[PDB]
Symmetry: D2
Subunit: 462 residues, 4 copies
């Protein structure tokens, strides 16, 4: 069995949910129809490391419909949907992923996506978080200098370092010969992208890399629209609270905060915003939101939402000043936006999964969601498929561009070209009934663009 | 054991949830504090027939805190929350309710709320749907005319009639004796209020009844704000679908439909509305919604919501014209807004509990929610506590008024007096931080009102 | 010349503006087309007393297209548009109206609409404010008892009383014989309607009267939609102020205040509301508005809008606490919502017409619009034609109903029947592209209405 | 008299309006207070060419309060407010501007800002549209090559070239001598910035230039918020039309179109959008607007707004398909968004100033605003002061930076540094009551920024 999944019997269920997801992921489905004849990924052998969910499944089969051969693993030990994995295997793709897998299994499975049968090699990486890429790069270094895997600080490292030693025993140059076949990497997260920029700095980047995280279509959907669609859903599943008439404070008015504010206001909450950036604060104010400090908000608001990407924006003294049964949640950085640690010295009482009462020295209670982790993933189900369709359609056009024209690119990190970012948007228009107009020749000349785009300058903010 | 519940062990859990709910139900709690000293319900013996949930538990303990003696049953066989029932019993109230009870047990439990110890009788009814009222009125007539309980249309009538026949054997004047002791009824639903108006018309109403359904505070919260708060919640739990960019059609632009349109629009849907009432249609047009026909919408919309209270507003031929994986749901009348029965001829495939695929001959599928029953109750959790607080504060003030001043009233159906309706609203203001202003003497005279209210004429529409 | 206008030469201009207004008044234009064949007003001789504007002109010619003969005057000395009057005369209708006419001329012109040539008599009154109706009723009394015009308090009375004495000299029973021919009155304002209710009380109402002021379509358009369309326009014409980011306080959250709040929020103002009615306050709160006292708002808000219909809701001490260059206006009762009188002791400095600086003892200035009169009429141009189309379409269907079936009605004040209120709405649907649906027989029975309406019970609030 | 204005008598009026405007322009006023002591512009001699309005007067006196010596002209022959010019002259600034001046007078006035007394020279240019900059650059080249001012395309060039030829006769090196003294230019318009980038490309830029057009604060206020605030204002002054229930189409969904759509929707219009950019189109779809074609909209919409910056986006055949009395206007490029010229073949009829009927052969009419020029400027009063405060605070900070630190800059076009852009926003917060928060040291390090800013990376889109 060239796969490791929870239970292949879950395949039929997975296929039914794939069939449903496809309708909500028109960008991916339309790429299949458009590039059918050309088979642009014929000859591509893609190693993929990305949350093994139903939506990722639609991406896998798009890559296959375009001609790719694919091996897949999850980028997280808990994010796999076992029935999705099952259905993808049943359809003929090696998957090494199950929910609740150990760290040892995680790093093993990250090797498996790079062990192709019949003397073959992966020639593309599709990554989320950069673990797959990190494995080849660090393993290659360990070949020359074992010391780099000699002193593991944490738990993830013990498992990573150990897995590398195990493969160096199979083949003393296990990693470098595999790295030599990679034609391109496409990466979609902030952390993965930071890692690539550092490799480039260190002269350690041996192929072109596409930063897809910073495209307009990916960032708007992943940040603004995705969280707008999901904040209130998580709050309601957890608490069933009435939103109308409540004071809700959103910390941060970037893309995530903008979406949060908009959804809360759409239900009749009074929305306050906190900010450290005066441009963002002024944007919030021009939408009729009151811009306040968290000190001011702390004893007044009913609902607190953190969207700053920063550290301890809701702190011990804020919570201490809070109203009884104030609801506190986080939709920003995966942790530490709220100082949950500083409340651990007080009585807690579980209300239900991902919902807890914290009881302060005076008997005043606060309701905390997902233990200060991401409310949209802990109390709801994360981004809807249409949102993920925009992210994954980016990843797909990036794979096509590097596999197909990667020789035109240096061994550097590149943001997706505007014309492909525009194409991502265009691929989603028919689903939602939007009719795109066309410039005439005179009009294209008049505003100084090609009829085919790109339509805006690189500095354009949308 | 003067109670029948699922499991008395659930009491501690129920008490924890009651403690949470109280903070979201300020009308009930503030009533407890305001009327504490007066104990206006001392000497009241209330037979209640109302969904035995955590929220109803808060109402029950409010009635008790005001001096009432109380016995309770559910008005529905499936709506009971067993931990709620348990906590209320443990706190000293007879309850006759558990989730999933039978129709035989249902009607028996309806008798038990009228069986008081120490030779005492119920003197007040707090009703939802009118079953408690019906039992006594039908049963009383059946004492002198067994023909009324002779021809059961219906599985519910079969159970009802049996229980009457069974009690007639114990005492030929079981109902009669009890009916004569009722000083008043308070009723909060359309169905219950229709039954009362019909009794009044027939001269069969032997006590004053308060119609609390048609109060402004009750109708607004129960119809408009409640459904606004919970429509999308149900759709998202069921489907996790992206709302932005979708065409959603709402059939009906009354209170319910107004709330629906408003929540869908708040998330970036294009909202279309159908209507038969030109006034309601013009209202919709003035908020920027296109007013369309269901025939026009059938093959164009992505989301269908029925809010008409009418019959087969989505029919077989509409569903057949629908777009593949269109979502169809009902938030209006309990059933028959959608012609679900006409699709039973087709293969169905369950997606998950309360979510079904209907497969048409050409392979096109429709996603139907809650089998065409109520999506906010089937796929979500129903109205939030603050909403129910408005309905139940209406019931409480109605009980106080009829118990303490019923002599002032005739044997008719009255809508809650405007000043009590205003009181319901007022009791909810402190929670949401709304500061009410006071008229001066000059100002009250200038507009022709008392400083204490009521503030509007009886025909005022708000 | 059976007319008195400013200048008949203005007719061509007026006709051009009539032709423009008709497109925006589909209710009136559609009545013409629908009732063409029937000529329901053939035999009607309508005396009309209503602001002689372009929009009223479209009403006059609708009445004529339906078969009426008409004589017209203004209900206000300043509201006439001279080119409208000119165009209506040129088309063959006697008009007695010009802007800036004296009180003597006003009362003379009110007689002229009741002096028909060739021994004829008016048999219908179309009134706004009840002056026309008052003339006949009071004149009739003076015939029997001169004392009722013996002691005039004010300026309007001196002119009224004098005009009556003058006509009693022509014909000692000038009024009563004219009153005897009136088959019906239709009245559209609050004041006019109060006067009718008082006549009825006093047994002094000799014909049926329609209160059109309280119809749903007239009240929603005249109160809510009209002021929503126009508040910000008046503020901007006067001040050119940026609305976004300002705190704007609306006193009152009835129909006018509701519209005001909604328009201000639509431009990104932070909107606060004050209220004395807790139901209205709770409505405001459920839309996310903060409900505050004027004492709280006075030193904080940038923009103050009064919509209460009450007395001195913005008072001396409020203005004294105001921020420098706060803008103060009134869209409610025609005066005394603001205590402008109490500021008259302080320096004023005109900024431009209808805009004044008030300079307080400490040098802090406030900007007052229209001297505390109606901002939408003083700084903008009042209600748009579509709004007036709803009012006047009411007046027209009321005229048709009383002329045509007035024998079915007692000599009482009646609100317009719901089926005619619905018809008003329906007549406006085609213009705005709204497609009204139709009940089937089964559906009409199911919800208990006729297919033709009315569709809602009398107590329905919309 | 070192000035040329319409009437110095208008000065007191102008001063009154300047005093009002100041309260709505907190960025300029707060700059005066903050930099008072430092007098950073002491030694600066600023030649300004910018619309001589009341708002520009506030900018001028801010520059003076900071130590600058200043001479001023308008950048447009018709934009001058004569009372503003007068007040600024009376307060001691040479101004060369009056409303309705000729092109000959225009260019002469442009020379006068460069003629300083006591043998001194301008050392800074504050420009709008780039005419002041062009004069010196073109004129300098013309000294050594008279061919550049030999072939005038254009009535404006005829005037420009004459004035250069006239000054060349007085001094063959008139421009040269002056050009060499310029330390910097600040430019705020698209046209001016394009000219600067073209000079830079040709190596013809002898000093650092700040592009203030593309700052976030300038572009947002000038493009989005400014047009949002004033679109409907213009339409209503022109037509007094009802907006609710109308279909309004906005061509373009960039900054301007985004603001338009938002204001129209806020009043209950159904808003459709056209676009050629799929990203912008998806943005519109995500806010619930239908994205349509102008061909589809042509015969359906009631209101047409062009915001594309493109050429003939409304053409002859669109207008011919339009609904009778459709309103057509342009808020985008100064002209040629609508093919007005193609309708000159038809009879026109003026409705009023800036409002015209275009009469088609079949008698169908279209209402065109401002003859297809800018409706916010033609039918209203342009941007409000708070908006202009953001543009002019940008200019002020740009002047301070180039004057005090220009040595740090090369002879290129720079966009305003992000930290100054942030400063513009910050300076506007106190007015609107927005409370900015401060990062702690730990928080600044955690997200990788200085506590003082800048807070975002250069590619951040807001
Ligand atoms: N929950 C999710 O599923 C999800 C999805 C996408 C992104 N994110 C995360 O959300 C976070 C924010 O994302 P974004 O795209 O909005 O980033 P952003 O940088 O665009 O916006 C963050 C905002 O927070 C403000 N801020 C920083 N510190 C603050 C403080 N101490 N107080 C008040 N405001 C402060 C900044 O000025 C900034 O405008 C990131 O960590 C991102 O990774 C989460
Ligand atoms: N889901 C819930 O939890 C919940 C809560 C409250 C009320 N309701 C129910 O929702 C239904 C509607 O309630 P409401 O308060 O909005 O009633 P309503 O009478 O105020 O509104 C119903 C609207 O539907 C329109 N309508 C009737 N038949 C139609 C048809 N064939 N096509 C288009 N429109 C049609 C009517 O003209 C009307 O204006 C009722 O059955 C009510 O009991 C449900
Ligand atoms: N400006 C116009 O062109 C125009 C058009 C229509 C109506 N009106 C007038 O506007 C006024 C209001 O009309 P409406 O239809 O909204 O009336 P309404 O009675 O429906 O609403 C008035 C509201 O003001 C509140 N109120 C009374 N005194 C108050 C106080 N002291 N402080 C705060 N709130 C207070 C009341 O509770 C009420 O809800 C009336 O005088 C009406 O004639 C003006
Ligand atoms: N009226 C004013 O006072 C004022 C103020 C600021 C800017 N503007 C002007 O408005 C215009 C637009 O400004 P912006 O900042 O929105 O520019 P922008 O580039 O941000 O937006 C223009 C939009 O129009 C779209 N477009 C181009 N041709 C089109 C076509 N044929 N059909 C449909 N869409 C088309 C583009 O795709 C684009 O996204 C510019 O000319 C600008 O100078 C006017």
């Amino acid at each position: 069995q060239d796969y490791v999944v929870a239970d292949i019997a879950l395949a039929g269920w997975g296929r039914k949910e794939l069939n449903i997801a496809e309708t909500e992921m028109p960008g991916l489905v339309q790429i299949r129809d458009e590039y059918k004849a050309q088979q642009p990924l014929k000859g591509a052998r893609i190693a993929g490391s990305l949350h093994m969910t139903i939506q990722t499944g639609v991406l896998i089969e798009t890559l296959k419909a375009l001609g790719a051969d694919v091996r897949w693993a999850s980028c997280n030990i808990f994010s796999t949907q076992d029935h999705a994995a099952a259905a993808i295997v049943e359809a003929g793709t090696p998957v090494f992923a199950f929910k609740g897998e150990s760290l040892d299994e995680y790093w093993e499975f990250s090797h498996r996506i790079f062990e192709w049968p019949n003397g073959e090699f992966a020639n593309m990486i599709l990554d989320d978080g950069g673990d797959a890429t990190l494995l080849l790069i660090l393993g290659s270094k360990a070949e020359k200098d074992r010391s780099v895997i000699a002193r593991p600080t944490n738990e993830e490292e013990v498992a990573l370092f150990k897995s590398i030693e195990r493969h160096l025993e199979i083949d003393g140059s296990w990693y470098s010969k595999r790295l030599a076949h990679i034609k391109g990497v496409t990466e979609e997260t902030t952390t993965g992208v930071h890692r690539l920029y550092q490799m480039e700095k260190d002269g350690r980047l041996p192929f072109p890399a596409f930063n897809v995280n910073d495209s307009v279509t990916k960032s708007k959907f992943d940040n603004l629209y995705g969280c707008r669609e999901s904040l209130v859903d998580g709050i309601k599943r957890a608490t069933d609270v009435m939103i109308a008439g409540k004071i809700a404070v959103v910390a941060g008015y970037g893309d995530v905060g903008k979406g949060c504010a908009q959804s809360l206001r759409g239900l009749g909450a009074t929305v306050w915003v906190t900010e450290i950036d005066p441009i963002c604060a002024l944007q919030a104010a021009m939408e009729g939101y009151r811009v306040v400090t968290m000190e001011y908000a702390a004893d007044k608001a009913d609902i607190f939402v953190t969207a700053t990407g920063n550290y301890h924006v809701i702190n011990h003294d804020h919570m201490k000043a809070m109203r009884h049964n104030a609801i506190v949640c986080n939709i920003g950085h995966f942790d530490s936006e709220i100082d949950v640690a500083s409340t651990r010295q007080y009585q807690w009482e579980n209300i239900k999964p991902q919902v807890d009462h914290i009881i302060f020295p005076d008997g005043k209670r606060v309701i905390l969601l997902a233990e200060g982790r991401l409310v949209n993933l802990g109390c709801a189900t994360g981004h809807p498929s249409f949102v993920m369709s925009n992210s994954f359609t980016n990843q797909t056009l990036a794979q096509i561009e590097l596999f197909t024209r990667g020789g035109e690119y240096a061994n550097k990190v590149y943001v997706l070209p505007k014309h492909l970012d525009e194409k991502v948007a265009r691929l989603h228009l028919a689903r939602i009934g939007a009719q795109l107009s066309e410039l005439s020749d005179d009009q294209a000349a008049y505003i100084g663009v090609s009829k085919a785009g790109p339509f805006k300058p690189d500095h354009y903010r949308y």
